Amino acid sequence: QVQLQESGPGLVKPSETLSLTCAVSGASISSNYWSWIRQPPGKGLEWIGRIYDPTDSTDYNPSLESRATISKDTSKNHFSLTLSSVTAADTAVYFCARGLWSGYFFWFDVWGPGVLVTVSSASTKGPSVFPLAPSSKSTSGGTAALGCLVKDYFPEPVTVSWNSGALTSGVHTFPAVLQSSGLYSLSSVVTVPSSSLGTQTYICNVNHKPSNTKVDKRVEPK
């Protein structure tokens, strides 16, 4: 029942300070331990640090200690991470987690979904969303493939859903690719029965939080 909600910028300029907050629901931060963890792209998990609310006590990874600060807000049931003097080496998905203890034993029992922070001097840019229309060339003996092309955005990530999440079966959203321009591009496809292409409406929902871009594109036969 305990949920950890993370928030913070997807984009940070080099040398400046990264700030992230973990809003907790279904539990009080006045109990147990609260930690931050990060995962650089293509890399493993790295423990950053933890805080204990009642005593305001903290412990840090010695590799980040000089730049990292974990703090708490009891009135808002929130705990936060401040990381100063960031570089591209700090680009990662940042996770928050509750450390639960029971006697000798300690472990992380719930995690936040993670937030991708990108350390770059480049500007934010929202995506254009183009339909990948179904047709005879995307029909295969009963099944039709359709999709959306999400092009030229920065930074990551973009989230894609179909019919507001009511449709996940047969859906494939592909890893973003970094183009020559320095902008990302992504596609999402769903295979459906051909007979439903006139009966059923198909809509891709696209969100790019870093630029506050929200697009709902309908996809119809051509």
């Binding site: 493993g44 990874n61 034993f105 493939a145 092309l149 092009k151």
Partner: protein, 213 residues
């Protein structure tokens, strides 16, 4: 500090198999260890704590063992849903430290790709750019060759591709490839084609279309 050595780095196994991952600490950690599963794109989730205690709702196919410096995670009957990277964590002494991780992949039978080609939308062409997309759907193993052709001339240096992680239902991959030309260059040619080669195909599959015909 305490260093966690996890092994293997990756493994491939068939459904129903029993696989074991091991973590070794530089120092005895008194069963102060837990294990996490991370599916692609998702946050980690707790599997095991206190070396062998199962988290609520965790399948009994996952079991933990060990003491002193040596610990193991075992998946007794590997399922397609278990494709993930697995991490151990020592909870014995700060700084807390994770293992490097173990990627788990499913070995399965060959499956040929379904191939679809998408012309650029009228919407995009109004912008002066043209993206042609080729979809390879639900295949195994991962290795696949996509060759773009424009009026039968083999393209090079103007496409990019992406491959999904292994599917949690059927352990297949899918691949998206985009050919990007200018609107001008696009309107100079007629026949756009992607030719696919793959172990499950007796011959190369070509999907093509005629620009506006």
């Amino acid at each position: 500090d305490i260093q966690m050595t996890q092994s293997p780095s990756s493994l491939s196994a068939s459904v129903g198999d029993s696989v074991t991952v091991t973590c070794r600490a530089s120092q005895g950690i008194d069963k102060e260890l837990s294990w996490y599963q991370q599916k692609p794109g998702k946050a980690p989730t707790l599997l095991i704590y206190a070396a062998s205690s199962l988290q609520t709702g965790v399948s009994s196919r996952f079991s933990g063992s060990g003491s002193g410096t040596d610990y193991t995670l075992t998946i007794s009957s590997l399922q397609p849903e278990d494709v993930a990277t697995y991490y151990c964590l020592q909870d014995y002494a700060t700084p807390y430290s994770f293992g490097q991780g173990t990627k788990v992949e499913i070995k399965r039978t060959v499956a040929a790709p379904s191939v679809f080609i998408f012309p650029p939308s009228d919407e995009q062409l109004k912008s002066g750019t043209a993206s042609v997309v080729c979809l390879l759907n639900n295949f195994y193993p991962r290795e696949a060759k996509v060759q773009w052709k424009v009026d039968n001339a083999l393209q090079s240096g103007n496409s990019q591709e992406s491959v999904t992680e292994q599917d949690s239902k059927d352990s297949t991959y899918s691949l998206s490839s985009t050919l990007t030309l200018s609107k001008a260059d696009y309107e100079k040619h007629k026949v756009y084609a992607c030719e696919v080669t793959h172990q499950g195909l007796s011959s190369p599959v070509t999907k093509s279309f005629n620009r506006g015909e």
